[PDB]
Each structure stands twice: as C-alpha cells, then as structure tokens.
C-alpha cells in the first residue's frame, strides 16, 4: 500500500521526521485507473464504510449540453485532443477531467434541425403548431456552428472519469471556444 499522510516527507524547516507508525489502512490511496477508449470495460471495488466506486477504463458514451439549459443528449465519445496538465494523454487516448474531446456532433444538428428544422447552413399540423410557436430562437453563434459543417465538434469533460465510472462533460461555449481555439491552434 501507498500512504497519504505526512509522517514521512521532510517538514517545513527541513527537519527529517524519523518516522513512527508504519502505515495503516485508513489513509490508503491506490494505483490510478488512467482510462482508455473501447466500449465499457469497468470493474467495481468496495471500500470505506460500505461503499462503491467504479473503476472505469475503455468508456464509450457520454452526454453533453448546449449549455444554455442542459439537454444532455446521448453521445458516443471519439478521441482525445488537448489537455492542460501534460502531454501524457494526447497520444495515449486517456480522457481525464478538464480535458478536450471530440465526440461525434451528429445527433445534435440532427436534433437542432429536426426539432427546429431551420435548416442552416452547410409541413404537418404540429410543426405549424409547436415548431412555429418557437420562432425567432435558432440564432445561436457562428463559431459554434461553423464547425457544424464537416460533421464533428469539440467538447470538454466535467465529470470524474475514473472514480464515478462515468463521463459527463459538455461542449464548449462562447469565449471558451475562443480560448482553446487559441491554445491548440498555434501549431502549424
């Protein structure tokens, strides 16, 4: 086991703590998950007090917002693009928190132009009732839909990959497009 307390680890003034209390169980951390892609190979540990935590490697499907309200459309993940912490997980395809993922972006403009059907920009009695009631709404932004031409768009993660066994992020918004489209783009 690997410990987590500071009974080792030279103190503030530089004095060594000659260590007592060889390591116990209640401070135990353990080896990371360092997740992957590849369709739902998850195990399950049991731990403190009687509790579940889901070890997650090779996840396949998340859910991602507008994020005007939080629609959470069912969405498969595709790959790994860019990360703040290190260049560890770009060329190993690990998706962590605060990461950048391309997902598929195909059911969204499907939804955005079947529930609206605008249709931008590369009938029945109810679309005259309920779609026509929601007129003057579909104006969104250019650089959030200028990537809705080739087929795919970016997203970030804001759920815990390896502990909770899940992956529930959101596609970026507004200025946070314009930040990460300055981060990774200064390459060629």
């Amino acid at each position: 086991g690997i410990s987590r307390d500071s009974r080792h680890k030279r103190s503030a003034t530089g004095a060594k703590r000659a260590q007592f209390r060889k390591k116990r169980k209640f401070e135990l951390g353990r080896q990371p998950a360092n997740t992957k892609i590849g369709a739902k190979r998850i195990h399950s540990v049991r731990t403190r007090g009687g509790n579940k935590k889901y070890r997650a490697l090779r996840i396949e499907t998340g859910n991602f917002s507008w994020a005007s309200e939080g629609i959470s459309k069912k969405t498969r993940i595709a790959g790994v693009v860019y990360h703040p912490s290190n260049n560890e997980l770009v060329r190993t395809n690990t998706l962590t928190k605060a990461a950048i993922v391309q997902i598929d972006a195909t059911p969204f403009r499907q939804w955005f132009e079947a529930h609206y059907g605008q249709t931008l920009g590369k009938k029945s009695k109810n679309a005259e009732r309920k779609w026509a009631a929601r007129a003057a709404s579909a104006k969104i932004e250019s650089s959030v839909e200028s990537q809705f031409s080739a087929g795919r768009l970016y997203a970030c993660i804001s759920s815990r990959p390896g502990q909770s066994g899940r992956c529930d992020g959101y596609i970026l918004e507004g200025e946070e497009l314009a930040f990460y489209l300055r981060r990774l783009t200064a390459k060629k």
Binding site: S6, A12, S68, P84, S85, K139, E141, E176
Partner: protein
C-alpha cells in the same frame, strides 16, 4: 505571482457552476460570484469588481473561515501568492517569576485584492488547509502606518 489579465496558464480558469448565457447580451456583461464572509467582517470593494479567479481566495473562492482568529505583522511579500507573518508573544516562566519572549511565525495565503509590504499590521483567519504549511487566510489589511498617501517630496 500574477498580473496581466489574470487568465494565464495551461487551463482556462473560471468559477465552478457559474454560467452567464452567451445568447443573452445585456449591458452589465458580468456574472461573477462573490459572498459575505462572516464574523462581522465586511467584504472589500474590489472583491466585487475583481477579475482574479483563484479558488484559494477567501471571498470569491471556496473557503469558510471557522477557526481560531489571530493577528500579526508581515515580514515578506517576496513569497509568491502567500505571505509569512510574525507573531511576537510573551511567555511567563514560574521558576524565575519573570517573562521571556519566544515567538512563532505563521505563513498565510492572501487574496490578490490586497497589496501589502513588510510591516503592515494584519489579522488573519483559520481555514481548511490550502497547502502543506498554511492553514490561514487574510481577512483585512488595515495597514495604519504613517503617511497614508501624504508626502510630497
């Protein structure tokens, strides 16, 4: 340890669970959270119109001051984003019936909304441990030395 439109580093920095709608565009253009501190403490004025994010902030970030409240004075602002302060205090010893000065100094993280120097009589507040040594955060400077913007030459 920062300046210059404080978004600085390899991640984007923003407050969690905060969302201004990009489709909405009013004349305020601010959805920046803050709170009230407690203890009869006012929150400072620049902590409402700030630009720093830095979660270790006492007011805008995520701490809650709930411990033993102390008071001291600054020995250095040369340490980056955190300050070490000196407390002097007497200590009676019963054998010799006389006092003796022993001290103990404290490091303390500070809000970027304060600008302090060596000296600068200051009180702090005990918070959940932001780093290894530090368990404290500043609350108000009140550096009432001489010449509060006085001297001409």
């Amino acid at each position: 340890s920062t300046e210059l439109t404080v978004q600085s580093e390899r991640a984007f920095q923003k407050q969690p669970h905060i969302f201004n709608n990009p489709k909405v565009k009013t004349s305020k253009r601010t959805k920046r959270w803050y709170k009230n501190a407690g203890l009869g403490f006012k929150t400072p004025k620049t902590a409402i119109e700030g630009s720093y994010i830095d979660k270790k902030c006492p007011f805008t970030g995520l701490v809650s001051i709930r411990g033993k409240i102390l008071t001291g004075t600054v020995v250095s602002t040369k340490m980056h984003r955190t300050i070490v302060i000196r407390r002097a205090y007497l200590h009676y010893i019963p054998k010799y019936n006389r006092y003796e000065k022993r001290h103990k100094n404290v490091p303390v993280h500070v809000s970027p909304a304060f600008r302090v120097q060596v000296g600068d009589i200051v009180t702090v507040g005990q918070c959940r441990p932001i780093s290894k040594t530090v368990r404290f955060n500043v609350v108000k400077v009140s550096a009432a030395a001489g010449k509060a913007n006085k001297q001409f030459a």
